[PDB]
């Protein structure tokens, strides 16, 4: 009969659960036509992790494994393991190794190696195209490209540290709501966290939005997550039984005690608000969500 709670961390004290970034703004977009079915940052209110969601902030969009060999530039093939170093078992009921990126694009980062007295080391910038046919993490194998042409070692322990995107040009295929093909071509994704949507008229999804760095080119790309990584960590530990399908939360200014607005926090781990407008939410950065009650569909959210 443990009471349900949320972290009392403010917006400026929260981290994106789909990419290692601080939360920048709250965001809505009712006109979104795409299916919202991200796999990272997915956790039920009673603490069940879903999709490819794991607890470490360092784990998000990260890869561990070993380069097997070199294969449009300098490309490398890499077997991927679980983040804890154990081999990935494709027969597990997960879409891909936990922490695998859940969107289409050219993910920019650093590949580093420490060889199996003192071991030798190297690190270089790298790009992983998650839309590519050779992106098959569910099969335990992915590909990455480097500006560096030769200084990558085969058969040695390898780590990918995500930094941002390589590009958001048309030919870079950045779409945050398009899932990768985890097993590659002509196979379907499996064990996916369910899609999310508002089921009541006048409501839209509320996102925690972070802006993502770019290696080059023009753009201000953003990543929207359903719940911050701190919420995932919190919900998992508490494992508080959900007493309805919807928790009523209020976004509160602690300095004034004023309720800026209220939202529904749904069982599958996402928020909805009564808002017609799209774009960022004008609110103080020291604001936070407060859990006030378990409600049902008879409760109607006040307009935002």
């Amino acid at each position, epitope marked *: 009969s443990k009471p*349900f709670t949320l972290p009392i961390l403010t917006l400026g004290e929260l981290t994106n659960s789909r990419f290692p970034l601080p939360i920048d703004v709250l965001y809505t977009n009712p006109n979104e036509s795409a299916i919202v079915q991200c796999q990272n940052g997915r956790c039920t209110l009673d603490g069940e992790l879903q999709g490819t969601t794991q607890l470490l902030p360092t784990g998000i969009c990260a890869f561990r494994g070993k380069v097997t060999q070199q294969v449009r530039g300098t490309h490398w093939n890499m077997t991927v393991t679980n983040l804890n170093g154990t081999p990935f078992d494709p027969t597990e009921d997960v879409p891909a190794p936990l922490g695998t990126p859940d969107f289409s694009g050219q993910i920019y980062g650093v590949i580093s190696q420490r060889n199996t007295n003192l071991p030798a080391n190297r690190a270089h910038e790298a790009v992983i195209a998650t839309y590519s046919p050779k992106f098959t993490p569910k099969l335990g194998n992915i590909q990455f490209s480097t500006w560096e042409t030769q200084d990558v070692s085969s058969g040695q322990p390898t780590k990918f540290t995500p930094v941002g995107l390589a590009s958001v040009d048309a030919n870079s295929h950045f779409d945050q709501w398009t899932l990768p093909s985890y097993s590659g071509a002509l196979t379907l994704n499996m064990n996916l966290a369910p899609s999310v949507a508002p089921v009541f008229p006048g409501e839209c999804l509320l996102f925690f939005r972070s802006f993502i760095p770019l290696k080059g080119g023009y753009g201000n790309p953003a990543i929207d997550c359903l719940m911050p990584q701190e919420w995932v960590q919190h919900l998992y530990q508490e494992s508080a039984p959900s*007493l309805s399908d919807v928790a009523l939360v209020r976004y509160v200014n602690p300095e004034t005690g004023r309720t800026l607005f209220e939202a529904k926090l749904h069982r599958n781990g996402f928020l909805t608000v009564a808002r017609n407008s799209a774009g960022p939410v004008v609110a103080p950065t020291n604001g936070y969500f407060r859990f006030d*009650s*378990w409600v049902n569909q008879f*409760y*109607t*959210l006040a307009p935002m």
Partner: nanobody
Amino acid sequence: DVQLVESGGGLVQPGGSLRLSCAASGSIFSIYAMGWYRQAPGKQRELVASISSGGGTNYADSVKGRFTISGDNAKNTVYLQMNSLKPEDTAVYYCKREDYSAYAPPSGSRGRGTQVTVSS
């Protein structure tokens, strides 16, 4: 353990107006939603209007623009102002309340209902 006392039923000339009131007492919670359902003769129950403690309101499309729901929190009472009534609004009107808690599932209560008849 919540009690609902309804009032304001009766016969009304078409084009006229009526005011329904529902007062809640007992084990009520600060977070809640109160509303009205109706059952027309030879028909099933349908939502008319509801109001929530946060200030949100919901209306059936059939009564939008004619009916207004509101509340006086000091009296723990909600009101249904029914204007521009037509014969099709003839029904038994039921008061419904959901009481909400952080520590328990939602708890529901309902009223006995009042007859509202609209006819020349």
